[PDB]
């Protein structure tokens, strides 16, 4: 290829020491069109994302963004669906390898570290392109309890307590920091309501049980569970009252 | 460096060598119908039909050199009435040498009376068409008249987006700029080698006024002559 | 590098030919009982020893070669050729033939000019020496990899001019003895470069001897008598 | 891209670019002397907080018999000097006789030319000067070119070149009728001539003397007061 | 997006890879193919544009049979369609052998989606120029229809189209209600849609290529009987006329 | 104008959703000599036009023998033709060697398509630039298969590809029903008439420029040379 | 019969390994520290050329090491010698040592070439 | 080298030339042809020079059937005397070592004829500056000192972005790698002190129709060509990207 | 993939790729290290932009075989990859020589990896600069591995934002030898001089090294040093 331009070739650094391909991957994540949130409560970790179904011929059940890598580890995906599914499969493979070799469950920290290493590989080798998707890992840890880690195509994997990703990421993060500074009990219902209302207020729309999908992992039940539309409707009624 | 480049420039430049043995051809004798044949098929058709009756004495040859083709650029005149001229140019003239060739042929003192009839063949792929190139007729042809030609073309003119470059375009541009009546015939043929179908498609031109009285009919003599040049240099083993 | 010109010329080999043309004039003569090499020198060496700039070398004892072009690729090809000579002397235990090493160098150049991952050598190795039976030899490879035996060849700066001058001069009467061959080589070199003197790097090899780098004092005295003969 | 493609005129490219990079890469100097071949360099910037844990900057030691100075890219110079040490120790393991200077410089230039020949890597753009006494011949100094061929330059200077002064100082003593002290004097004179900005000031230049004393190559680097008196000789030269 | 549309591993300033979009639009260049996922099963319909009478009937077939149960309708480049059909055949056979039972449509769908996405990732290899509808019916899994966009998405559809007339076909399909009916009427409906979307002025002629999988064919992807195809074509012609 | 930017490689998609390299490969078949392929209810005749030049220079063997019941004719590049013929011969021989069964023509064509699809997808490659007219007779019956330079292939009743093959295509399309219900001699004569209409008006079907390969119900694929084509030329009307 | 005389030698420092396949006269020789069949050339005495004719079977064509070693070994012995030199760079002097290394073994074990 | 279409040799005294440049793709030429078609600028002469590879074709701006059957050489010039507007039209690629003679010849032509302001529509490479092109607007300008101060203050009021003055060999000489002809032409004009301005745009190779629309809108904003559906595209803008879909491919 | 070298010499001869890598390194959080008499410290700023970021998950310091320790300024995935590579090299050296890897050879190995990654095609130079730590023979070490692969021994140096001001501050502050328990104070003051606000316990990390090795200490431990 011999792509001399910095803007259309990952390897070459920009004159200001920046990687334009990574920025364009972030713009792809934005182009996904959806927004996702994640909050680490004192008792569980939540992930809330909207499920906008084009038209009606498409089966709403098939389209999803909540994925589980390990039975305790959940995930939410933002960006191109193909890239998201590829990263989910790679994370599943990494979890299986860790279970087979080390013998115990893959910690969320180590899973995000591995995914960040893969992203570094992608963003360093000129052959391939950075995957246009952002993945947020949640799970219950025996030592740190609930754990929220967000991995990004750049290779940045710092753990969070409350985080968001998507087109409305900035406003969601602002509102989430505002909520965090209050520092209330952060109970299951509290954290779930915080996340869902953050998404609703940043999108400036009313939420329906079928319009969004919610998944939660709790200390009492380490296994990751995707909340059914009935539970989401109950929580929406809770916000209403 | 510069001297080497200058030596190359000479090697590439067209040199006019008289065939009767720095004055240009038209500067030496004026013409009234200068026929230009570009490509092997064009010169083959010329030799078959037009150069059948008359002396057609050799007057000059514009020898040149380029990375593609060094063949010949022999010029002819009927010699029964030297008013009518002719040119059988098979060697490919490069872009940097086309205007040198124009200067050698005409120079800077044209007569402004010649009906420049240009004979050339292009490939079907060059033809810009709305549909696929495979749907086009194999040997179909097109014409490009100038402002003051005024003589109806025997074939439909080219479409707007389609263009022609290289030496035929060079001569046509020279004629248009200096207001010389002319017409550029394009024989869009799928086979660029010597094939009698291409000259069969070139046939309609001898019927029109352009190159009308030069051919002394005799289709049998011309048709037999066409089979003479059908034998050509052995091709390579690339295609079978 | 791996693409042909419209006329059928590989660009890399032609560029290597140009590099050779910019090189010094390697001139050799196939004399009986004596083979003489000669290469034009750029003098200079005001603070540099002539040992490291010796364009004429010795591949083993029965072969000596000179080159014209870039000196780095020349050094590496010389190293490979001498390594091959030593390996043959070790395994086969026979004196390497001039034909053998010339063909090896030509094959190496062909390999390097064929693959597109590596550029051709930009030199033309002029190889001389004596075979097992003592037959004088004269060869000249090219970046393309075409080795050709010659009676008296000359390749480098103004290769064609010196080659035709030497062809006009080269005769068995001029090849008799060894002083006459030295005169021929020095005459060709002086025709190339008028300054002469230090520019004339002269080397001689006899039938049963090794490569003798003729001393500059010997080179200039031969030049003087050559001048005397002209007058 | 076309890192190993011949130019139309035969001027292989990226190696003139290496040449220019060397040219604007300081001023490394070295002059051969009968007592012992000498080397010199330009200690760019004061570097007050820098600690000289290493043997010296731009003057890397090649085992016990050879030392080298570079005037090119620092990283490439480091890698190539590490390779030089590796090859020298390799030959020492092979035979007790230490690697001759000519063979080692030939090996390094072979690596550089191989990079210049096989595509897939930018040429190593570092020019090196090797000092060292050898069992064969004697004290030797070689000028290396990042594009390949080395040289046997008894006196040479890379970077800012200006070989006229070094030639006028080398041929002054017949180029073979010199002494070590004359070598330091001439090196200081030429360095001062090259150093247009003010003048060489002690820590602005680092030199190393490689002489065989009692059958032992001593590679002694001059600094502190050793360089202070060298520039004092520069003051002596000014008079 | 000039300059950023030459490699599949280059992101445009907007943040999209243009090679994949060009692959989708090249799929658009081909004639439209329609699939329907009714309650009884899945029915396929492809506008097989006849090029010349010389080609024997059945040539350039667009409806492939990956296995007994799983079929496929394709669009875009037919060479890539055949290659993907072979790959899906291999995957389905591998699963049937290793696990012993027929592959669920979801597994084949996401595996082939991952493969095509892998092709879209790298600069050397180019994205597949074909989009296909992996549709199948099982007595347990149910009537499932998955479209595999060259991008690498595996979305379950109740009905969708791919080709030049994709938009109008989708509009007509959504006018149709694809729930709770036998495929016996779905064949007629899909033939009707194909007839409407077909453009006689541009496309000289076409051939109806209908295949279905469902309880009527015992969950097997088989070409519809000639009588049923003729009846569907007659109904479509009658509806189109006036 | 714009297509020039999206036709350098085979892995680039044009803004029009096209790969012009595949189109150029598809024209490479037209660059070759004309060939005609037609079949009847019991036979599959493959008629090829040998280059009408001095056969002394080169014996243009357009029709090649693949198996006892499969044979093909070359239209396009010779290297790709040879590779494809060798590949088909390997597959047929492997089938008959392991399973002891004739390889069906359709399976062989599917394998050819799968093999020829890879170069189109991969970088730095090119599609096989040759068009094959596979005249075979498997259990189902006679089969004329058109293999384009692209991996796409067509099962054709009658076909003709190469230079100026449109006239042959017209003739074949005008007489399909006759081809279906013709015997060996009549079908061969029809193919020869198609080839003649491919030829110019002046040129006629000579023994030097005509080769035919016939595979039938009880006839193995046999290539008839210049001497063996006269029987069909005799009895064929000139008009 | 085929005598598979597998042996190793600490050439220079790296423990480069060796392999032998006698057959009848078509000796096969492999060289390389890592077990890789990178290059391979076959050379045997030819009645038409003074140098035994050799061709680079597989591997990089710009190596001229396996071919040369095969030619020299085919001149030393009779018939074919399938040399498979597989050293990455080894400069060129190291190759001479290996040629010495194999040479010593042939003197020690003429039968186990 | 101006040759009139008829024989009157129309004078271009007090006119403003509109020349394109061989830029990245064909942005300058496309925009020039677009404005020619929109403004219905009649042909007046034929600038026959020895610098471009010859080419011929029918009238790019067919309009009427009679005007459709014409001849278009590599270098032809149209003008609209109503607004004292003249416009050259380049439609050919250059011969090696011939662009500078073109610069000199056209500078002499404009100086002698009287065409005051020469507008050079062009385009530069996408990357352009040190990431400044990605941050700032692609459009720029480059006007010679001889340009009328009225136009200079008009541009200043327009609040445009001036040329980045890309660093070159001495230290900040304006460099336009995409245009190629643009730099030498500007230098020749400055030597001749001929009023002219280069209106370029950081673009990349590919489809450049939107770039042409942007450039013509830039020119309209400056000189109010049309009205500071909109531009009537030429009939030449047809089959500019392909030659039909081969049936066997799909 | 893209085996041909992508870092190409400029006509003038400067390697623009390395210069851009150095610019990216400069555009990073300040990281200052001191080679004190009794130890070497690597105080760097672990700046939490928002309360959402949790410093307890990721760390900017990483000890190598106890004695060695590293920090970085820019990027950070590259830093993680380099840390993994250096740890693997240390393990290999220890298991093959049966002795802990001395500092200088680890610096040489990482610099060689950087040089390979800037030289070989298909890849970009690492956009990070590494500050080694070590207690070899019982002395400090402050090698600064630049992205190109040039490591220089220092006594007081900053590499991130406002590294020039930090260098001047250290030159006007750092003693000829100083001592442990004061190098941390000097580094904290340098960070203050090059900070965008206030430092909490977990807003900066210290890479103090001693006879035991490069120790990360704890947020409470450093918090004690901030009050002093």
Please say whether the beta carbons of I143 and I132 come within 8 A.
Answer: yes
Q: Number of structural domains, chain F?
A: 1
Among E26, E79, E125, select the one facing F150 at the smallest CB separation.
E79
Task: Please tell me the distance in Å from I36's CA to the nearest CA on chain A.
Answer: 32
Q: Which one, of F183, F157, F151, lies nearest residue F169 by Cα?
A: F157
What residue in C sits closest to G107 (Cα-Cα)? C91
Spatial contact of A210 and A51, defined as CB atoms under 8 Å apart? yes
**Touch between chain D and chain F: 3 or more Cβ pairs under 8 Å:** no
Chain I residues in contact with A109 by the CB 8 A cut-off are 57
How far is Cα of residue B230 from the mean position of the Cα atoms in its chain?
Answer: 19
Mutate which: F8, F10, F23, vs H, most H CBs within 10 A? F23
Roughly how many angstroms between the first and final C-alpha of chain C, as a whole number?
51
A67's tokens: 């994925």
Cβ–Cβ gap B161/H240 under 8 Å:
yes
CATH classification at residue E222:
3.60.20.10
Rg of the Cα trace of chain E? 18
Q: Which among F35, F214, F222 is positioned nearest to F130, based on CA atoms? A: F35
Separation between Cα atoms, residue A198 and residue A204, nearest integer Å: 10
Pairing mode, if any, of strands B116-122 and B33-38?
parallel
Q: How far is E155 from chain A (nearest CA, A)?
A: 6
Structural domain of F111: 4-237
**CB–CB contact H53 B147 (8 Å):** no
Q: What residues of chain A have any CB closer than 8 angstroms to a CB in chain H?
A: 4-7, 14-16, 18, 20
Residues 26-65 of E with CB under 8 A from H: 29-31, 51
How many cross-chain Cβ pairs, E to I, lie less than 8 Å apart? 3
Q: Hey, which residues does C69 pair with through a beta bridge?
A: C123
Q: How far is CA H184 from CA E125, H102, H198, in A?
A: 41, 10, 12
Helix, strand, or coil here: I84?
helix
Q: State whether E11 and A3 contact (CB < 8 Å).
A: no
**Domain with C40 in it:** 1-231
Judged by CB atoms closer than 8 Å, whether chains meet at H131 and A16 is answered as yes
For chain D, give the number of residues: 239
CA-to-CA distance for A126 and I2, rounded, in angstroms?
7
Question: DSSP states of I131-148 as a string?
Answer: E----GGG-----EE-TT
Contact call for D and G: 3+ CB–CB distances under 8 Å: yes
Cβ pair D90:G91 closer than 8 A = no
Alpha-carbon span H128 to H125, nearest angstrom:
5
Across the interface, of F5, F150, F154, the residue whose CB is closest to H249 is: F150
Contact predicate G71/G17, CB 8 Å: no
Which residue, among B68, B110, B61, has the nearest Cα to B88 in the 3D structure? B61
Please tell me the distance from the alpha carbon of residue D68 to that of residue D59, in angstroms, as a whole number.
6
Please name the member of F5, F120, F155 whose beta carbon is closest to the beta carbon of E79.
F120
Rounded-to-integer distance, Cα E228 and Cα B64, Å: 73
Q: Structure tokens of C143?
A: 């970046």
**What are chain I's partners, defined as 3 or more CB pairs within 8 angstroms?**
A, D, E
Please give the distance of CA I215 from its chain centroid, rounded to a whole number. 14
Supply the range of the domain harboring residue E35. 1-239
Closest chain A residue to H134 measured between Cα atoms?
A7
Secondary structure of chain C as H, E, C letters: CCCECCCCCEHHHHHHHHHHHCCCCEEEEEECCEEEEEEECCCCCCCECCCCCCCCEEECCCEEEECCECHHHHHHHHHHHHHHHHHHHHHCCCCCCHHHHHHHHHHHHHHHHHCCCECCCCECCEEEEECCCCCEEEEECCCCCCCEECCCCEECCCHHHHHHHHHHHCCHHHHCCCHHHHHHHHHHHHHHCCCCHHHEEEEEEECCCCEEECCHHHHHHHHHHHHHHHC
Contacts of E13 in chain H (CB under 8 A): 134
Cited resolution, angstroms? 3.0
- Which member of G12, G89, G91 has the closest CB to residue D94? G12
Instruction: List, in order, residues 6 or more apart from E210 with CB less than 8 Å away.
Output: E43, E44, E45, E46, E187, E190, E191, E223, E224, E228, E229, E232
Give D82→chain I minimum CA distance, Å.
9
CB-CB under 8 Å, H130 with A7 = no
Return d(Cα I122, Cα I116) in angstroms, integer. 11
Among C73, C80, C87, the residue to mutate for chain G (most G Cβ within 10 A): C87
The span from the first CA to the last CA of chain E, in angstroms, equals: 45
Tokens describing residue B159:
């479409």
How near does any CA of chain F get to the CA of B5, in Å? Answer: 30
What token pair was written down for E67?
A: 């296995």
Among 3.40.50.720, 3.60.20.10, 3.40.50.2300, 3.30.360.10, what is the CATH number of I1-228?
A: 3.60.20.10
Q: Which residues of I33-58 are buried (b: 16+ CB within 10 A; e: fewer)?
A: bbbbebbbbbbbbbbeeeebbbbebb
Closest approach of B167 to chain H, Cα-based (Å): 8
| G68 part of contact set with chain C, CB < 8 Å | yes
As a whole number of angstroms, the distance between CA H91 and CA D81 comes to 58
Domain boundaries, chain I: 1-228
Measured over all CA atoms, what is the biggest interatomic distance in chain I, rounded to whole angstroms?
55
Q: Do chains E and F touch (3 or more CB pairs under 8 A)?
A: yes
Size of interface B-H (CB pairs under 8 A): 96
Residue F46 · residue F212 · CB < 8 Å: yes
Which residues from chain C sit within 8 angstroms of residue D151, using beta carbons?
A: 48, 52-53
Cα(H112)–Cα(D74) distance, integer angstroms: 59
Q: Pick from F13, F120, F173: which is nearest to E53 by CB?
A: F173
In whole angstroms, how far apart are CA A58 and each of A207, B236, D174, F159? 20, 58, 94, 43
- Whether chain I has a CB inside 8 Å of the CB on E124: the answer is yes
Query: CB distance G91–D107 less than 8 Å?
Result: yes
Confirm if C83 and G95 have CB atoms less than 8 A apart. yes
The CA radius of gyration of chain I, in Å to the nearest whole number, is 17
Interface check F166 vs E, CB under 8 A? no
Chains in contact with chain E (at least 3 beta-carbon pairs closer than 8 A)? A, F, H, I
DSSP output for A173-233: HHHHHHHHHH-----HHHHHHHHHHHHHHHHTS---TTTEEEEEEESSS-S-EEEPHHHHH
Chain H residue with the nearest C-alpha to that of E81? H250
CB C85 within 8 A of CB G36: no
The bridge status of strand A35-40 relative to strand A162-166 is antiparallel
Report the distance separating Cα C34 and Cα C38, nearest Å. 13
What CATH number should be reported for the domain holding residue F190?
3.60.20.10
Q: What are the tokens at H189?
A: 């004009």
3-class secondary structure, I83: helix
Going from the C-alpha of H37 to that of each of A106, B183, H41, H68, H241, the distances in angstroms are 68, 26, 7, 13, 20
Give the neighbours of chain H: at least 3 Cβ pairs within 8 Å: A, B, E, F
Q: Do A16 and I20 touch (CB under 8 A)?
A: yes
Whether F235 contacts F205, CB under 8 Å: no
DSSP 8-state class, residue H201 = B
What the block records as the tokens of I193 is 């001089």
The alpha carbon of B152 is separated from its chain's Cα centroid by a whole number of angstroms, namely 20
Q: Is residue E79 within 8 angstroms of chain F, CB to CB?
A: yes
Rounded Cα distance, E83 and F136, in Å: 23
| Cβ-Cβ contacts under 8 Å for D139 (sequence gap 6 or more) | D32, D33, D34, D36, D37, D131, D132, D133, D210, D212
- Chain H residues with CB-CB distance to E under 8 A? 25, 126, 134, 203-208, 211, 245, 247-250
- For residue F219, what are its two tokens? 């006839």
Alpha-carbon distance A118 to nearest alpha carbon in chain H (angstroms): 28
**Considering Cα of F63, then F67, then F68, then F72, what sign does the dihedral take?**
negative
- Could you count the other beta carbons within 10 Å of the beta carbon of residue G104? 10
Tell me the CA distances in angstroms from H182 to A2, B108, C1, E2, H145, one per residue in order: 26, 31, 33, 22, 16
Q: Domains in chain D and their CATH numbers? A: 1-239 (3.60.20.10)
Instruction: For residue D37, give the nearest of D180, D150, D164 by alpha carbon.
Output: D180
Q: Say which experimental method was used.
A: cryo-EM
Q: Compare all CA atoms of chain D with the CA of I150 and give the residue at the minimum distance.
A: D75
Q: How far is D88 from chain I (nearest CA, A)?
A: 18
Three-state secondary structure call for residue H57: strand
Instruction: Report d(CA A8, CA A24) in Å as an integer.
Output: 10
Q: Which residues of B touch C6 (CB under 8 A)?
A: 67-68
Say if the Cβ atoms of H134 and A7 lie within 8 Å.
yes
3-class DSSP state for residue B45? helix
Q: Which domains does chain A possess?
A: 1-241 (3.60.20.10)
CB of H204 within 8 Å of any CB in chain F? no
Q: Which two tokens stand for residue I98?
A: 């049966």
Residues B172, H69: C-beta atoms closer than 8 Å: no
Task: Tabulate helix, strand, coil % of chain E (nearest 5).
Answer: 40, 20, 40
* Number of structural domains chain C divides into: 1
Sign of the C-alpha dihedral computed for residues C21, C24, C29 and C35 taken in this order = negative
D27 at C interface, C-beta within 8 A? no
- Residue B216 neighbours by CB distance under 10 Å: 12
3-state secondary structure of D156: strand
Q: Which chains touch C (3 or more CB pairs under 8 A)?
A: B, D, G
Q: How far is I4 from chain E (nearest CA, A)?
A: 14
- From chain G, pick out residues whose CB is under 8 angstroms from the CB of D83: none
Residue in chain F nearest B237 by alpha carbon: F78
Q: Are H73 and B176 in contact (CB under 8 A)?
A: yes
Token pair recorded at residue C79: 């190293």
């Amino acid at each position: 290829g011999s792509s001399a331009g910095f803007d259309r070739h990952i390897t070459i650094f920009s004159p200001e020491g920046r990687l334009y391909q990574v920025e364009y991957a972030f713009k792809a994540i934005n182009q996904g069109g959806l927004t996702s949130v994640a909050v680490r409560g004192k008792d569980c970790a939540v992930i809330v994302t909207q499920k906008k179904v084009p038209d009606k011929l498409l089966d709403s059940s098939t389209v999803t963004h909540l994925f589980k890598i390990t039975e305790n580890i959940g995930c939410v995906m933002t960006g191109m669906t193909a890239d998201s599914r590829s990263q989910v499969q790679r994370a599943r493979y990494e979890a299986a390898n860790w279970k087979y070799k080390y013998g115990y469950e893959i910690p969320v920290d180590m899973l995000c570290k591995r995914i960040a290493d893969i992203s570094q590989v992608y963003t360093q080798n000129a052959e391939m392109r950075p995957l246009g998707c952002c993945m947020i890992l949640i799970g219950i840890d025996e030592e740190q309890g609930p754990q929220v880690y967000k991995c990004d195509p750049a290779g940045y994997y710092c753990g969070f307590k409350a985080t968001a990703a998507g087109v409305k990421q900035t406003e969601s993060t602002s509102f989430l920091e505002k909520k965090v500074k209050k520092k209330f009990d952060w109970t299951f219902e509290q954290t779930v309501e915080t996340a869902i209302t953050c998404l609703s207020t940043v999108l400036s729309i009313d939420f329906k049980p079928s319009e969004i999908e919610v998944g939660v992992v709790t200390v009492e039940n380490p296994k990751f569970r995707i909340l059914t539309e009935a539970e989401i409707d109950a929580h929406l009624v809770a916000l209403a009252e | 460096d510069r001297e080497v480049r200058l030596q190359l420039a000479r090697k590439r430049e067209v040199r006019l060598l008289r065939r009767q043995t720095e004055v240009s051809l038209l500067e030496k004798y004026p013409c009234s119908k200068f026929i230009i044949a570009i490509g092997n098929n064009a010169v083959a058709f010329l030799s078959s039909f037009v150069m059948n009756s008359g002396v057609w004495e050799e007057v000059g040859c514009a020898k040149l050199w380029n990375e593609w083709c060094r063949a010949f650029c022999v010029f002819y005149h009927l010699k029964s009435n030297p008013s009518v001229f002719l040119c059988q140019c098979s060697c490919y003239v490069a872009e940097d040498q086309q205007y040198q060739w124009l200067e050698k042929v005409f120079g800077s003192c044209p007569r402004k009376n010649m009906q420049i009839t240009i004979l050339t063949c292009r490939h079907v792929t060059d033809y810009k068409t709305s549909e696929s190139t495979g749907s086009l007729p194999s040997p179909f042809l097109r014409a490009l008249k100038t402002q003051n030609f005024k003589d109806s073309a025997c074939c439909p003119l080219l479409e707007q987006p389609n263009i022609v470059h290289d030496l035929p375009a060079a001569v046509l541009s020279y004629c248009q700029v200096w207001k010389i009546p002319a017409i550029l015939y394009l024989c869009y043929t799928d086979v660029m080698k010597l094939d009698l179908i291409t000259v069969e498609a070139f046939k309609p031109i001898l019927s029109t006024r352009s190159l009308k009285g030069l051919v002394k009919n005799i289709p049998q003599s011309t048709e037999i002559l066409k089979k003479l040049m059908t034998t050509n240099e052995i091709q390579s083993n690339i295609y079978t | 590098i791996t693409v042909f010109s419209p006329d059928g010329h590989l660009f890399q080999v032609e560029y290597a030919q140009e590099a050779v043309k910019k090189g010094s004039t390697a001139v050799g003569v196939r004399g009986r009982d004596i083979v003489v090499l000669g290469v034009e020198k750029k003098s200079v060496a005001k603070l540099q020893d002539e040992r490291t700039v010796r364009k004429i070398c010795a591949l083993d004892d029965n072969v000596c070669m000179a080159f014209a072009g870039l000196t780095a690729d020349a050094r590496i090809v010389i190293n490979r050729a001498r390594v091959e000579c030593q390996s043959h002397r070790l395994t086969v235990e026979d004196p390497v033939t001039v034909e053998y090493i010339t063909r090896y160098i030509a094959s190496l150049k062909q390999r390097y000019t064929q693959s597109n991952g590596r550029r051709p050598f930009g030199i033309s190795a002029l190889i001389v020496g004596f075979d097992f039976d003592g037959t004088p030899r004269l060869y000249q490879t090219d970046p393309s990899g075409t080795y050709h035996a010659w009676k008296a060849n000359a390749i480098g700066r103004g290769a064609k001019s010196v080659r035709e001058f030497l062809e006009k001069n080269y005769t068995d009467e001029a090849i008799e003895t060894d002083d006459l061959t030295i005169k021929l080589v020095i005459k060709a070199l002086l025709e190339v470069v008028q300054s002469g003197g230090k520019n004339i790097e002269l080397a001689v090899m006899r039938r049963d001897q090794s490569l003798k780098i003729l001393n500059p004092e010997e080179i200039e005295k031969y030049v003087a008598e050559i001048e005397k003969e002209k007058e | 891209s076309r890192t190993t493609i011949f130019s139309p005129e035969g001027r292989l490219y990226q190696v003139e670019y290496a040449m220019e990079a060397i040219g604007h890469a300081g001023t490394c100097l070295g002059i051969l002397a009968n007592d012992g071949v000498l080397l010199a360099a330009e200690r760019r910037n004061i570097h007050k907080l820098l600690d000289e844990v290493f043997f010296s900057e731009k003057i890397y030691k090649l085992n016990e018999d050879m030392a080298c100075s570079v005037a090119g890219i620092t990283s490439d110079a480091n890698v190539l000097t590490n390779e030089l040490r590796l090859i020298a120790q390799r030959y020492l393991l092979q035979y007790q006789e230490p690697i001759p200077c000519e063979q080692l410089v030939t090996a390094l230039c072979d690596i550089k030319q191989a990079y210049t020949q096989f595509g897939g890597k930018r040429p190593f753009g570092v020019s090196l000067l090797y000092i060292g006494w050898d069992k064969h011949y004697g004290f030797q100094l070689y000028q290396s070119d990042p594009s390949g061929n080395y040289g046997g330059w008894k006196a040479t200077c890379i970077g800012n070149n200006s070989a006229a002064a070094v030639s006028m100082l080398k041929q002054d003593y017949k180029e073979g009728e010199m002494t070590l002290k004359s070598a330091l004097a001439l090196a200081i004179k030429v360095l001062n001539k090259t150093m247009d900005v003010s003048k060489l000031s002690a820590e602005k230049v680092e030199i190393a003397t490689l002489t065989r004393e009692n059958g032992k190559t001593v590679i002694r680097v001059l600094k502190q007061k050793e360089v202070e008196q060298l520039i004092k000789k520069h003051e002596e030269e000014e008079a | 997006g000039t300059g950023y549309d030459l490699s599949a591993s280059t992101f445009s300033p907007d943040g999209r890879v243009f090679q994949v979009e060009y692959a989708m639009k090249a799929v658009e260049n081909s004639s439209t193919a329609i699939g329907i996922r009714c309650k009884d099963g899945v029915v396929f319909g492809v506008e097989k544009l006849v090029l010349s009478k010389l080609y024997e009937e059945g040539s350039n077939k667009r409806l492939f049979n990956v296995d007994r149960h799983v079929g496929m309708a394709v669009a875009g480049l037919l060479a890539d369609a055949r290659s993907l059909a072979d790959i899906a055949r291999e995957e389905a056979s591998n699963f049937r052998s290793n696990f012993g039972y027929n592959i669920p449509l979801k597994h084949l769908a996401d595996r082939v989606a991952m493969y095509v996405h892998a092709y879209t990732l790298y600069s050397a290899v180019r994205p597949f120029g074909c989009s296909f509808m992996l549709g199948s019916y099982s007595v347990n899994d149910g009537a499932q229809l998955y479209m595999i966009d060259p991008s690498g998405v595996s979305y379950g559809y109740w009905g969708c189209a791919i080709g030049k007339a994709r938009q109008a076909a989708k509009t007509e399909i959504e006018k149709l209600q694809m729930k709770e009916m036998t495929c016996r009427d779905i064949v007629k409906e899909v033939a009707k849609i194909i007839y409407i979307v077909h453009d006689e002025v541009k496309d000289k002629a076409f051939e109806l290529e209908l295949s279905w999988v469902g309880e009527l064919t015992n969950g097997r992807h088989e070409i519809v009987p000639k009588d049923i195809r003729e009846e569907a074509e007659k109904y479509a012609k009658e509806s189109l006329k006036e | 104008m714009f297509r020039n930017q999206y036709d350098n490689d085979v892995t680039v998609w044009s803004p029009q959703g096209r790969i012009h390299q595949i189109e150029y490969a598809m024209e490479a078949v037209k660059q070759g000599s004309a060939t005609v392929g037609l079949k009847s209810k019991t036979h599959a005749v493959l008629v090829a036009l040998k280059r009408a030049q001095s056969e002394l220079a080169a014996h243009q063997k357009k029709i090649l023998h693949v198996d006892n019941h499969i044979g093909i004719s070359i239209a396009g590049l010779t290297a790709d033709a040879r590779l494809l013929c060798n590949f088909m011969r390997q597959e047929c021989l492997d089938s008959r060697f392991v399973f002891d069964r004739p390889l069906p023509v359709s399976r062989l064509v599917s394998l050819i398509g799968s093999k020829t699809q890879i170069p189109t997808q991969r970088y730095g490659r090119r599609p096989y630039g040759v068009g094959l007219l596979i005249a075979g007779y498997d259990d189902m019956g006679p089969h004329i298969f058109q293999t384009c330079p692209s991996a796409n292939y067509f099962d054709c009743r009658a076909m003709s590809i190469g230079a100026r093959s449109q006239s042959a295509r017209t003739y074949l399309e005008r007489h399909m029903s006759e081809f279906m219900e013709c015997n060996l001699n009549e079908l061969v004569k029809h193919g020869l008439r198609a080839l003649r209409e491919t030829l110019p008006a002046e040129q006629d079907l000579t023994t030097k420029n005509v080769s035919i390969g016939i595979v039938g119900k009880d006839l193995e694929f046999t290539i008839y040379d210049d001497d063996d084509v006269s029987p069909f030329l005799e009895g064929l009307e000139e008009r | 019969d085929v005598s598979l005389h597998n042996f190793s030698a600490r050439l220079w420092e790296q423990l480069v390994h060796f392999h032998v396949m006698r057959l009848t006269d078509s000796l096969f020789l492999w060289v390389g520290a890592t077990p890789h069949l990178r290059n391979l050339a076959v050379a045997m005495c030819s009645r038409y050329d003074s140098i035994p004719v050799s061709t680079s079977l597989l591997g990089d064509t710009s190596d001229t090491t396996s071919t040369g070693l095969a030619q020299r070994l085919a001149r030393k012995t009779n018939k074919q010698v399938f040399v498979s030199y597989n050293l990455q760079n080894t400069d060129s002097n190291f190759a001479l040592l290996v040629e010495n290394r194999i040479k010593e073994e042939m003197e020690a074990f003429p039968e186990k070439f | 080298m101006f040759v009139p279409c008829g024989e009157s040799a129309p004078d271009l005294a007090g006119f403003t030339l509109l020349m394109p440049a061989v830029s990245v793709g064909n942005v300058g030429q496309l925009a020039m042809d677009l404005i020619i078609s929109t403004l219905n600028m009649s042909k007046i002469g034929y600038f026959y020079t020895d610098c471009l590879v010859p080419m011929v074709g029918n009238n790019p701006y067919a309009t009427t059937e009679g005007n459709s059957t014409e001849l278009s050489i590599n270098a032809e010039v149209y003008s609209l005397p109503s607004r004292k507007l003249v416009a050259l039209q380049l439609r050919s690629i250059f011969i090696k070592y011939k662009s500078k003679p073109f610069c000199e010849k056209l500078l002499s032509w404009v100086k002698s004829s009287g065409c005051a302001r020469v507008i050079v529509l062009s385009s530069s490479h996408s990357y352009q500056r040190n990431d400044l092109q990605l941050r700032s607007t692609p459009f720029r300008y480059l006007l010679t000192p001889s340009m009328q101060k009225s136009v200079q203050n008009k541009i200043k009021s327009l609040n445009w972005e001036e040329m980045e003055k890309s660093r070159c060999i001495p230290e900040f000489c304006i460099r336009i790698p995409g245009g190629g002809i643009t730099k030498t032409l500007y230098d020749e004009s400055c030597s001749k002190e001929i009023q002219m301005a280069v209106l370029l745009k950081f673009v990349s190779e590919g489809d450049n129709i939107p770039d042409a629309l942007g450039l013509v809108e830039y020119l309209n904003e400056w000189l109010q060509i049309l009205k500071p559906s909109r531009w009537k595209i030429p009939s030449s803008w047809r089959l500019l990207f392909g030659s039909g879909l081969p049936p066997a491919l799909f | 993939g893209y085996s041909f070298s992508l870092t190409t010499f400029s006509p003038s001869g400067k390697l623009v790729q390395i210069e851009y890598a150095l610019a990216a390194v400069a555009g990073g959080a300040p990281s200052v290290g001191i080679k004190a008499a009794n130890g070497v410290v690597l105080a760097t700023e672990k700046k939490q932009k928002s309360i959402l970021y949790d410093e307890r998950s990721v760390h900017k310091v990483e000890p190598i075989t106890k004695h060695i320790g590293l920090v970085y300024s820019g990027m950070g995935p590259d830093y993680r990859v380099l840390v993994h590579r250096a740890r693997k090299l240390a393990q290999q050296y220890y298991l093959v020589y049966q002795e802990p890897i001395p500092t200088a050879q680890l610096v040489q190995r990482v610099a060689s990896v950087m040089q390979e990654y800037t030289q070989s095609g298909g890849v970009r130079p690492f956009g990070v600069s590494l500050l080694i730590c070590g207690w070899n023979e019982g002395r400090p070490y402050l090698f600064q591995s630049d992205p190109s692969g040039a490591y220089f021994a220092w006594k007081a140096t900053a590499m991130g934002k406002n590294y020039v001001n930090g260098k001047t501050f250290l030159e006007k502050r750092y003693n000829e030898d100083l001592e442990l328990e004061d190098a941390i104070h000097t580094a904290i003051l340098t960070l203050k001089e090059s900070f965008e606000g206030q430092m909490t316990e977990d807003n900066i990390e210290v890479g103090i090294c001693n006879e035991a090795g490069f120790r990360r200490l704890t947020p409470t431990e450093v918090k004690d040093y901030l009050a002093a």
